[model samples]
Target chain A: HHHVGKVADTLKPGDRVLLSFEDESEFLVDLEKDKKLHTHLGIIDLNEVFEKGPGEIIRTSAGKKGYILIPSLIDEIMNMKRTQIVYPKDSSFIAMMLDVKEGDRIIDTGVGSGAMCAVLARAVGSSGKVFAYEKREEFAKLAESNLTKWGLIERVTIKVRDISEGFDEKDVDALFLDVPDPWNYIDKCWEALKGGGRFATVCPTTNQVQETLKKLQELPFIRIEVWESLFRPYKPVPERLRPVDRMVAHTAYMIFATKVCRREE
Target chain B: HHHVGKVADTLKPGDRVLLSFEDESEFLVDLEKDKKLHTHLGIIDLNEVFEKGPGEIIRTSAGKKGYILIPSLIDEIMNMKRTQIVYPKDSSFIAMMLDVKEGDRIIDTGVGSGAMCAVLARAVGSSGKVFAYEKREEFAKLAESNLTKWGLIERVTIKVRDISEGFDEKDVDALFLDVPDPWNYIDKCWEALKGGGRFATVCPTTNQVQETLKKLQELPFIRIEVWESLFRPYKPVPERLRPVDRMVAHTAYMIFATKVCRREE
Candidate 1:
């Protein structure tokens, strides 16, 4: 249950909690006894935070009230030390498209800080295997260290190689592409996937999807779907339940296809 | 792997498959020997479909070619005997927002054909529990029969009662609202969820979200999110990689909030 907080009813020392202040600022903290936290609003002793339950208001030394909460996977991802951007809305949608679950084997191409790779590993569970390919050794180790901190390295095999060379695993259950030119590696992906396996990739521009679809048509693929998701946040005030002033208008064009047995034309 | 095909390599008699024709028309079928499928394009013999591997094209007697492949859950939901609309984009986004997984208890209100309920049940696995509340016995039984056909009835308990009265379970991991007026049942949902539990609902219009947030602010909830998903399909032809002529432009505004422990003022 690493994705969810332990002790559903009460907060514990090892739990990760979110403190949202009156001005809508949020702070994510891993709880520890006698650990004092400093913020722009004021300072608060972790002991006092440990004394209160989630959703309870705890006033800091400067008399600013903040609400405690159990951070969600979204919150954790947002707070992660990321170089590249992989929004939860896109990653979650990609996970659903892949239909990933426990005991599954998945591959993630272009593991930038392991954001999407970490997501796939969590969905696949401990019994599953996640092979992440990264061309950069520096980023590979960076993602590895991040995943190790998240306690998910046991199920993940980080390979430092160019995915265009080929995937080591054959007949994988699913594969996700995050590279700039996923169109160049279609054959490599086709060779690694099992029959009826899932394939997905994200491109920031429509031209990328256009090129990818060209190569995708050269092989045996079906159910080709292209889409994108928009996430808008609201103020959440009852009297003024309106959308936030700013939102991510566009992230990437999601492209999906299923690998099937090649047929002789 | 009910959500996915079991025999990943080959198709069997009892397997569910999708056939896409050159005209882009699709058909879902359970493969059985000697069964004939009649379509406007042509008539396909089930034996021919069963004999061919996925991604292979099977020619109908009338000279029409159809590509055989495994159907994803999104394909399954679209072809269901749905009395109401529950798009995959929304359901998948909601499931991710809830952060549902194996061995967790969840509740779904207003089970219309059990579309979203089925999604939640599959995510929770057989070890988890799903209590679906539907006031109309007719729709309740309809959803039960559908879930039974999908082999997910074992993990679900469909109740025929008004959810406003209350829920039988306490401190569940997550809850979803799909009724006409979810604002009226916020307290009931609050009572049923554990501290830091997930809550989500879909409103067809903005007025409903406005009303729901009024009541949402009365209780101890945090991380309130309001968003929507748009799904656009593209023509898979490499020469014509463009979006489809038409798509579902508007569906519902999704609302998400987290339930937490109540604090005395």
Candidate 2:
């Protein structure tokens, strides 16, 4: 596990340990190395970390101490360098809702940092193609880089184009739009998606959501739904299973609508 | 102005003043011989408050100073005792989404503090009736008190009943549920609502929302929608028109569905 810290007196050889530090300092060190880990508090020898077990506190060279533990995915995401990142919770839910599956071709607009693209690629597997449209050159490059870092570049096609102009891909199984003005691209989305294709957009404002929905409703789709996701972490302690004092309230409003080919009328 | 502090060295006989304090504190003070205000901060002399101008601050006898100014509805609502009160932003949006109009009969369950009921009452007017239900006796009393304070008690009926068992109201134009486990009452809500009536429920968890939708899909509704409201306040300053740092993200997930007598065979 990465991003662990310890503040015990010392660690012995081969002991499983978890390490963590305060204020964004994160690393895991084995005792075999004579090297020292540097922190704002001070440096500590890697050898000292070997003897500590999981949840043990270890002291730093400067007398500062911290517990050792594995870094959470949230911590990794927070530390990762990216232009725009989709939170895991939201991405996971979107994947579930969109029903992105293996061998399905998906279209994603505004591929910032490729966080969502990565998830889409994994869901679609090696055979499927993820057509990503991005207008900003720098953001596109960052997205491509992030996708490459995740080993998903082969699964995604990076297009530096505005989706508002139009989506070129046809028969798309699903479409995910994270653009600012999705209302402008609804027609393109409709044209590009196959029958019964799922379309989802993430909007920040209710006005934008309503406008998008109005456009969607005007189309010949059967079911048009608008919703927002909120994740509240409970204290989870036996007596404190109630909602936590703080929560991730709103990331964006999500509008989901399915495309239906005209069979009658 | 009620939360504002004093402005002058001493109070004089005839002066027009506004009294105000920090956020959620403000009131108009009229100069009188025997008027007094008892606040959690301290008792204030009404005469001293009336001596200050709109921008002036007034101090209590205990030396606590508050500014003088007019109070807005938001301030009043904030100062009102909170027992799960809905913000005006959400209430306004919900009213619009539900198409609540004058003379509409609305049913609201889990009426904590009755803020939502007050908004609905004001929207529906004197002819409209708001049936508010709360299982908790204390919350029911608190909601009744809040409605009375807003002078909407005449239009709202406080019912101390468990909505899970069922609701007694019929032909409800709109129903709003702010309770947990709303899935348990979906059948009752659907039955109580009239054809083409709208039903809205607020929940905190996606699991609850998903379960509610699963139940709602079995009902005779045309469109089922779920969403959460997030208010991101932007600074009015030209340089800071962007959203404020802190925001009200997820108070609850609101699920909306409209009753449709016509069902596809």
Candidate 3:
């Protein structure tokens, strides 16, 4: 049950690394002996970086100090190409709400940029699966390439089709619908889920959540919940400890519900 | 990589369960043949519930209906005795910050009520270990019993000693300090952690975080980050969707850093 593409402790050829400078400037690059990184400080020999490995200092030709840092999961996801992707603050919580674990099967709809998909794939490990449904071919291809870059493409099966038609799999452990008018597909979700399966969705507006809740209540869903996750960063200086001036006020409203057997009328 | 005491889909003879009435009043109980749960609505027969299984509606002697629910990890943690235990929202996020997974060793200090310990134990699976250190013998005993009741005690090694004296293990994967005066243990934490290991802590006051940051900056730690996670729940009525009137405003400030190699002078 190894993690997907577990980054090694040392730098390796072709491994992605984050080159951080003293002034807070950073560059995400692939390690290669033949490459050269030209920055404001000076030209950096990629071969030197390969020799130094991660967590070590490598001075540029101009003698400006820079560090070879290991980028974490959140860092990698944040660096990925995104358009309205799920942030780690919310994605991590969603994974827990799904009760995801090794060898569990999951379904992610509207796999925009594959941010949430990456989180799911990592938790499920190699023995699990993620069925991704994206309507647009362009977004699907983009997400597929993103997953491939992250070494999680193997765990997902991407389907480029409008979800109104429905899904192929049944009795999935959990399903997440990240699309507009999610209420319109309650039956589709109910049909794909097994008894006691988990269901979740994120809505940008209260009206959308209202609509989704209406459909969710119409079904056998229980433990229905709506939540908002707000994440704020703090300045970590010893003498000046305070929250960052600005923060992400709102991302999306998270909705979670569990599917259960229909009560006998 | 089995989960710690995985709950089966069907009701068992000794499994703890939640019973919910239509009005949302819920009760947590352990199943036994002779047990009877008395509520204002009616008296529920435990023996009949054992036969009916989870997800089924059971009628009390007074004909009131109640649904048997399988409490999730968060649900169980919330029901535990607590003076100040980590909430699911924060615990889940903290787990992500730690980058925990199956078979990865973790250390958690100040195991108050064993709330965060349960999250770590579950993530590490059966193969991993959690070294939980608590200073007070009373708190240690309480946490030990709580972990045992949750079936997670097997994975944890609880020590009734203060962490200020430092840890026995070296080169651990990750460590989290949730104690007062966490600043006093930076050296202890640094000694126990391996190069490139993860470290985190939570403080209730800015002054404490300020002190912790002062110490953290003096060390070889990298990627120093501070964050605060705020969670709010919304009422789920479809026609009248809005945020709940009251919400948890603040819990604690989270600080994350990576243990990196010391730069050569």
Q: Each candidate: fraction of true contacts kept? A: 0.45, 0.02, 0.51
Per-candidate total of colliding backbone pairs? 0, 51, 0
| Candidate 1 structure quality by residue, lDDT tens digits, B93-154 | 78767977667799998998888987788777556789999999999998898788666798
TM-score of 1: 0.90
Instruction: Kindly report the TM-score of the first chain in candidate 2.
Output: 0.76
Q: What's the lDDT for candidate 3? A: 0.80
Ranking by lDDT: 3, 1, 2
Model 1 chain B is weakest, by summed lDDT over 10 consecutive residues, at B1-10
Model 3 over residues B1-265: C-alpha lDDT tens digits?
1111214456777888888777778788889888998889888888887666455677878887777767666777777745788777888888877877656678899998998998888767666789999988888998898888777898899988877678988767789889878888998998887656789999988888899999998898877899987788989998777778998888888899887667453
User: Of the candidates numbered 2 and 3, which has the greater DockQ value?
Assistant: 3
Scoring the B chain of model 1 against the true B chain gives a TM-score of 0.88
* Number of the predicted model whose lDDT against the real structure is largest: 3
Model 1 spans with C-alpha error above 4 angstroms? A1-10, A125-127, A141-155, A234-242, A263-265, B1-10, B125-127, B148-151, B234-242
Best by DockQ: 1
Off by over 4 Å in 3: A1-8, A125-128, A135-145, A148-162, B1-7, B125-128, B135-155, B159-161
RMSD of each: 3.8, 13.1, 4.4
Chain A TM-score relative to the true structure, per candidate: 0.87, 0.76, 0.91
Give TM per candidate: 0.90, 0.50, 0.90
Model 2 alpha-carbon miss at residue A167, Å: 42
lDDT of 3 at A82: 53
